[PDB]
Design an enzyme around this catalytic site. Structure first.
Site, PDB file in Angstrom:
ATOM      1  N   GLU B  62       0.767  -1.394   0.091  1.00 19.37           N
ATOM      2  CA  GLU B  62      -0.002  -0.054  -0.036  1.00 19.37           C
ATOM      3  C   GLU B  62       0.891   1.199  -0.003  1.00 19.37           C
ATOM      4  O   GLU B  62       1.102   1.744   1.109  1.00 19.37           O
ATOM      5  CB  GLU B  62      -1.044   0.158   1.268  1.00 19.37           C
ATOM      6  CG  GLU B  62      -0.816   0.057   2.567  1.00 19.37           C
ATOM      7  CD  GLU B  62      -0.429  -1.430   3.156  1.00 19.37           C
ATOM      8  OE1 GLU B  62      -0.286  -2.441   2.049  1.00 19.37           O
ATOM      9  OE2 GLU B  62      -0.567  -1.518   4.558  1.00 19.37           O
ATOM     10  N   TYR B 181       5.137   1.981 -16.550  1.00 20.00           N
ATOM     11  CA  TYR B 181       5.733   3.015 -15.524  1.00 20.00           C
ATOM     12  C   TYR B 181       6.704   3.907 -16.254  1.00 20.00           C
ATOM     13  O   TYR B 181       6.751   4.973 -15.621  1.00 20.00           O
ATOM     14  CB  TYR B 181       6.585   1.940 -14.655  1.00 20.00           C
ATOM     15  CG  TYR B 181       7.252   2.730 -13.538  1.00 20.00           C
ATOM     16  CD1 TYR B 181       6.845   3.262 -12.348  1.00 20.00           C
ATOM     17  CD2 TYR B 181       8.707   2.814 -13.935  1.00 20.00           C
ATOM     18  CE1 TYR B 181       7.518   3.768 -11.374  1.00 20.00           C
ATOM     19  CE2 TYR B 181       9.802   3.588 -13.230  1.00 20.00           C
ATOM     20  CZ  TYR B 181       8.957   4.125 -11.809  1.00 20.00           C
ATOM     21  OH  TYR B 181       9.628   4.646 -11.133  1.00 20.00           O
TER      22      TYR B 181
END
Lengths: 543, 543
Positions: B62, B181
């Protein structure tokens, strides 16, 4: 933070400052006062034209693109003619996303025909000149003017006829503004030709934008003080850091003095662009402690406030003349039907922006905006706006300099370049024309050096912010309303609390437009390296 | 437009859809229902860990950067521990703009020392590989994996150790995500080393972000229906355009059927990432109509819903194991004091993100977030999170594969790589560890081809939008919460109504970072052409 705010000047800049104080400063309208120097509205000092005289457009040049400041601001203003919760932004995009703006007869010459404006008309040394311009440092372009830097042949390109007409820009004025335009509109430099990037309101900027904004502010409780012309501020300067103590104004012909506490904040529009305007018309002519007083007294106090004499020095350099034409149907509007994107009375865009007569010695341009222009105007009348750049030269048909020529005579030069010079008498009586000869309408465009204009918050100031077209940000001042809102936001944010040029796709969009839509220098190479890659879409196709 | 909305799935994606329906769809909470399959909160099926067992972090990864979706969303959610009108965004930027996140011991090896992570460690063929990767078309990279495309030496660079640890990414998974990315973080690729671009909440994402968001939604009137696992939707397909007719759910073990009108709209989180998780711990071990049912039945109906078997096919490929460590002070936290940006108990950032042991056969990483991690945890306890990538290999010290090794044994591999292998017994009893072995925690990262994932609104759909990490947008899915919100916004906007890579400064920021801060290929040239121009600032200085 139980303070009050004083806003010197009634305009888009002042109103926007009040808005930003309310929404994002989280203060209340009751603590905001706007100091105006108008009588009350319109009567003898007419408000903004009467439908039976002939109308007189404020003066001058009110054009808009799709910038973010407008969206951020007018998203919260209740609409002009629509119910809640419809905003003025929704009116703006409703009347314009249906009928987009673009031009059909942008450049004209030979007394009635269109000059091809598909391309910017740059050769190769001209392209190199603007690229070389884009590479120069801002520190190395003090006081350099347009004609000084640019070649003689460059000033005859489609590019310069379009650019000078769009912004009403003289060949003896600041090069920095042309450079700043390049750095910011490379993506959209093609739009100079078709007027694509331009977007207009239903009416004026006044009736469609500011009138909903003032109503909104009154419904928020902001205080107004007419008849108040501010001429100076008395300020303390301890520790190299200055604060405003009092507003020295003259209200109704008598000195006043308004006290300002340490917590309060002051916003002042510095210069003027409509100062010595003579309002002649069809048969008579123009003739020739002011609004510059506040800045001039500020300039005495410190160098951080700049040199206003550099902008108001030579009024022949910062002057051109407009004229508002009110026409009942005639051969002028009959000819106009031939040059229009739609019909003039359709209610949609008509001329799509200004139309510029290139071989006119006056550099004469005229526009018919989305009719009707005013809310109270009848269906058998059209409001055209006309203006010119050169005040020194004889017309092509009327051998008079335009500051000396008036009304009917202006119709002859206009009708000559329109191809209806034999039908002047008919249009002459059916069209009411009112002229405005403004001596500072381009004083912001005047040549300048670093330090000539103060920042929005000059170095040291803790409660004073300046607004308008005479303050140094990092952007251009050639868009009047945009620059007014930008400075207003900087002012409110700084005292309280708080791109496009580097885009590879935009450099390709620019380079192709500079080279008249034909493949530019490295393009054939850039295709061979990129056509079979992720980056194929950044290039435009070849013929 | 007096319709109701049905939201399948309890998560950040579902809640965000409800938010966007309220604020920007201008419907009311009373017409929104969230269909969850949880019992009620936490008891036997524990909610999110107890302070006396040893805590168990949801699972897993996270991490957050400073994107615009978060700002736009959590600007309107009342704060967790602050009064009105302070938002959770204000909590987020208060606790983080004071103590910025950055790492001191990001990479470690040789059982206790730091591996130099100043630079990405790319040679020259490695730089060329990523540049060549950036230039390939997305249509030409179907099913190609990391190790297939990249060289063997590339997978040992600092870059790959950092990238694979940050996103928990296997060498046999999709190349498209590494490419995506690159296209999006060229400006910030330097941040992979120091963890600058990462920004964390005070607590969890659950306690700091979603818990204020749920409270907000309940204060808006949205309906919740626990114990409801949806397994299929019956849909009509006339004119090549499909509409959802009914939600076939099983509520508390019995079939239900929820009718959906033509005006209504349905949002469904498709896949699962925590399905067959075995929850072993210190001394016992993990062992091994589902959440994939809804997507699987949808896949039967049409190809526009993709191939879920390509993501849930091989559970050994999409699996790694986490472990939540609850420590009362021991030599483990004493060693931790040596590797921390501040002190662990300070309340500020400690490890600054994950710490990855590069010579660990497990590819073992561990993080100590801003302590305390949970609101109810005492001052003499710290919650560390640990996880590893390779489930097939023997440890360096514990010669056991990690899916077979449990609890105390995990402490030995961790303490060995930390340089305190002789002090295991002390930390073993003082730290409570709970493990999670998730078999689909990286099923979204699995190799894929065009068409394998449905769009947020598949072609034809008029009232169904899909959410989560298994849907095709134009962006990456490697940021879990970011991607959940992005799909939620696309879903609400599309059914109703409605950059960084091309920046020249970013290509220079990237090229220098790829070349380990040393001047890259054209840089010496780019300085000579630009040092005395407007564009001097786009380049970084030379040594």
């Amino acid at each position: 933070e139980g303070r009050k705010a004083w806003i010197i000047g009634s305009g888009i800049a002042g109103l926007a400052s009040a808005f930003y104080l309310i929404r994002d400063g989280r203060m209340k309208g009751q603590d905001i006062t706007i100091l105006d120097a108008v009588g009350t509205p319109g009567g003898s000092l007419d408000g903004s034209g009467n439908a039976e005289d002939g109308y007189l457009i404020r003066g001058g040049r009110e054009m808009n693109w799709n910038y973010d400041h407008f969206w951020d601001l007018f998203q919260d203003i209740p609409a002009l003619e629509y119910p809640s919760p419809y905003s003025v932004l929704d009116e703006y995009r409703a009347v314009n996303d249906n009928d987009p703006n673009w031009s059909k007869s942008r450049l004209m010459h030979k007394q009635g025909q269109i000059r091809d404006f598909s391309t910017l008309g740059l050769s190769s040394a001209h392209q190199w000149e603007l690229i070389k311009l884009l590479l120069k440092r801002k520190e190395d372009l003090d006081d350099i003017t347009i004609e000084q830097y640019f070649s003689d042949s460059f000033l005859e390109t489609n590019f310069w006829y379009l650019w000078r007409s769009m912004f009403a820009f003289q060949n003896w004025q600041s090069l920095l503004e042309v450079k700043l335009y390049m750095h910011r509109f490379l993506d959209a430099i093609d739009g100079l030709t078709d007027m694509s990037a331009l977007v207009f309101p239903k009416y004026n900027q006044y009736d469609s934008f500011v009138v909903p904004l003032v109503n909104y502010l009154k419904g928020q409780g902001v205080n107004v003080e007419f008849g108040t012309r501010v001429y100076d501020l008395d300020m303390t300067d301890n520790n190299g850091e200055r604060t405003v103590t009092s507003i020295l104004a003259k209200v109704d012909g008598r000195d006043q003095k308004i006290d300002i506490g340490a917590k309060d904040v002051v916003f002042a529009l510095t210069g003027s662009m409509t100062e010595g305007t003579a309002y002649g018309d069809l048969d008579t002519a123009p003739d020739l402690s002011s609004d510059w007083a506040l800045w001039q007294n500020l300039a005495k106090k410190s160098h951080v406030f700049g040199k206003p004499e550099k902008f108001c020095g030579q009024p022949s350099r910062s002057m051109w003349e407009s004229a508002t034409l009110t026409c009942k149907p005639s051969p002028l509007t009959e000819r106009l039907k031939d040059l229009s994107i739609n019909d003039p009375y359709s209610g949609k865009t008509v001329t799509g922006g200004i139309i510029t007569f290139t071989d006119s010695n006056w550099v004469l341009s005229f526009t018919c905006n989305r009719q009707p222009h005013f809310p109270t105007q009848p269906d058998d009348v059209l409001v055209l706006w006309v203006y010119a750049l050169v005040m020194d030269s004889k017309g092509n048909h009327v051998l008079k300099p335009m500051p000396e020529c008036t009304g009917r005579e202006i119709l002859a030069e206009l009708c000559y370049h329109l191809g209806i010079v034999d039908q002047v008498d008919e249009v002459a009586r059916q069209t009411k024309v009112r002229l405005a000869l403004m001596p500072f309408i381009t004083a912001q465009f005047m040549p300048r050096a670093a330090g000539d204009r103060p920042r929005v918050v000059p170095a040291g100031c803790t409660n004073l912010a300046l607004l308008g077209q005479f303050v140094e940000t990092s952007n251009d001042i050639i868009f009047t309303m945009e620059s007014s809102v930008r400075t207003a936001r900087i002012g409110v944010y700084t005292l309280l609390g708080l791109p496009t040029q580097y885009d590879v796709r935009n450099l390709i969009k620019g380079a192709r437009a500079l080279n008249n839509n034909e493949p530019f220098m490295g393009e054939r190479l850039l295709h061979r390296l990129l056509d079979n890659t992720y980056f194929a879409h950044i290039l435009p196709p070849l013929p």
